[PDB]
């Protein structure tokens, strides 16, 4: 991985990181996933999660895929199906 | 010297100076337990 | 010699000195190094 | 096989790998098939599988054939036949 | 290049290739040998 080094001088910081506005990613084994809060995982099947954030969506690895913001308004209703393939 | 500002601590040493053209940034941790972190250029989260 | 010649000087074998002749202008360069020594405070790091 | 070496610097990684979006391949003997999760197979007849993924569809060998994404909408119904040849 | 130039080709370091430019005539010689192997019947003598 890289080494995002953020320095603050004047009201304009540079980094040779902010939070993810209601963003989520699809956790999986692949190549682990930690967090500087308390919990951390070194393994896993398919499980997504949202909420906290310090991670920077790296074009290299963002666990699987990334999805920002909360879309659906008030009136937007959604119906879901069971699924399964083959 | 070329912009430096090192920091020594019990067993571990933290470096964050953007020295001239050769960065001195390389916080080396020496966990006497059984681990030795010496990533000159690795996953280090610095800030100030 | 006669006239404005070359831009020679390329040692072979295990040496690394190259030649470059831009428009009749003699030029030669060495490569016997390619090692960087970054002095990180009380530590001399080499590459 | 090759040696896909991924390195991350800045939000733009290079590799001189990501997940397969709902992709599957047709496992068979041919030339084995492992996985860094837990299970792994060193033999086999005709059996397909989907789900996890780190494998990169190599133009050399992708087990047999590869098929990405989930197609059928909601209303799309499918009827299948028994089969068999000769 | 322009005109009739040099007679280069002298590798240094540990090499032994010399240059000789007689009246604008390009010439070079190697010396990476100087060892004689005199076959004296059922014996190969080297020097």
DSSP string, chain A: ------B--TT--B------TT-EEEE-STT-B--SSS--BS--SSEEEES-------SS-SSS-EE-S----SS-----------
CA distances from A85 to A52, C35, D54, D62, D78 (A): 33, 57, 20, 20, 12
What is the distance between the alpha carbons of residues D60 and A18, in angstroms, rounded to a whole number?
A: 42
Q: How many residues does chain E have?
A: 47
Chain C neighbors (3+ CB pairs < 8 Å): B, E
Name the residue in chain A with its Cα closest to that of D55. A30
What is the distance between the alpha carbons of residues A62 and A70, in angstroms, rounded to a whole number?
A: 19
Bridge partners, D48 (sequence order): D26
E6 close contact with C: CB closer than 8 A: yes
Provide the resolution (angstroms): 9.0
What is the distance between the alpha carbons of residues C17 and C33, in angstroms, rounded to a whole number?
A: 11
Quick check: E1 and C7 CB within 8 A? Answer: yes
What is the distance between the alpha carbons of residues E20 and A57, in angstroms, rounded to a whole number?
A: 65
What is the distance between the alpha carbons of residues E25 and E8, in angstroms, rounded to a whole number?
A: 10
Whose tokens are 């920077």? That residue is A56
Instruction: Read off φ and ψ for residue E38, nearest 5 degrees.
Output: -90, 110
Whose CA is closest to E18, among E38, E32, E4? E32
3-state secondary structure of B10: coil
Q: A58 near A2, Cβ under 8 Å?
A: yes
Residues of A in contact with D70 (CB under 8 A): 85
Angle, CA D64 vertex, CA D62 and CA D70 arms, to 5°:
80
What is the distance between the alpha carbons of residues B34 and B30, in angstroms, rounded to a whole number?
A: 9
Experimental method: X-ray
Provide residues of A within 8 Å CB-CB of chain D. Answer: 1-2, 28-30, 45-46, 56-61, 64-65, 81, 85-86
Quick check: C36 and B26 CB within 8 A? Answer: no
CA distances from D22 to A64, A85, B10, C12, D39 (A): 12, 10, 50, 55, 19
Instruction: Read off φ and ψ for residue D2, nearest 5 degrees.
Output: -85, -155
Quick check: A65 and D12 CB within 8 A? Answer: no
DSSP D48: E
Q: E33 near E16, Cβ under 8 Å?
A: no
What is the distance between the alpha carbons of residues A54 and A76, in angstroms, rounded to a whole number?
A: 30
Instruction: Read off φ and ψ for residue C23, nearest 5 degrees.
Output: 40, 50
Q: D18 near A25, Cβ under 8 Å?
A: no
Residues of E in contact with C21 (CB under 8 A): 1
Whose tokens are 């084994």? That residue is A29
Contacts of E17 (CB under 8 A, 6+ apart): E9, E10, E11, E28, E29, E30, E31, E32
Q: D29 near D45, Cβ under 8 Å?
A: yes
């Amino acid at each position: 991985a890289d080494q995002e080094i953020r320095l603050a001088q004047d009201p304009f910081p540079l980094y040779p990181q902010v939070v993810l506005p209601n963003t989520a990613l699809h956790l999986k084994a692949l190549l682990d996933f930690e967090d500087k809060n308390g919990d951390k995982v070194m393994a896993g099947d398919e499980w997504l999660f949202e909420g906290p954030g310090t991670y920077i969506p790296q074009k290299e690895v963002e666990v699987v895929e990334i999805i920002q913001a909360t879309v659906i308004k008030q009136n937007q209703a959604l119906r879901l199906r069971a699924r399964k393939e083959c | 010297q070329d912009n430096e500002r090192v920091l020594f601590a019990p067993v571990r040493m933290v470096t964050v100076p953007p020295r001239h053209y050769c960065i001195v940034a390389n916080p080396v941790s020496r966990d006497t337990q059984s681990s030795v972190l010496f990533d000159i250029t690795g996953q280090v989260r610095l800030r100030h | 010699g006669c006239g404005c010649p070359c831009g020679c000087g390329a040692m072979a074998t295990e040496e690394a000195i190259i030649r470059i002749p831009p428009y009749h202008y003699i030029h030669v360069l060495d490569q016997n190094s390619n090692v960087s020594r970054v002095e990180v405070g009380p530590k001399t790091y080499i590459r």
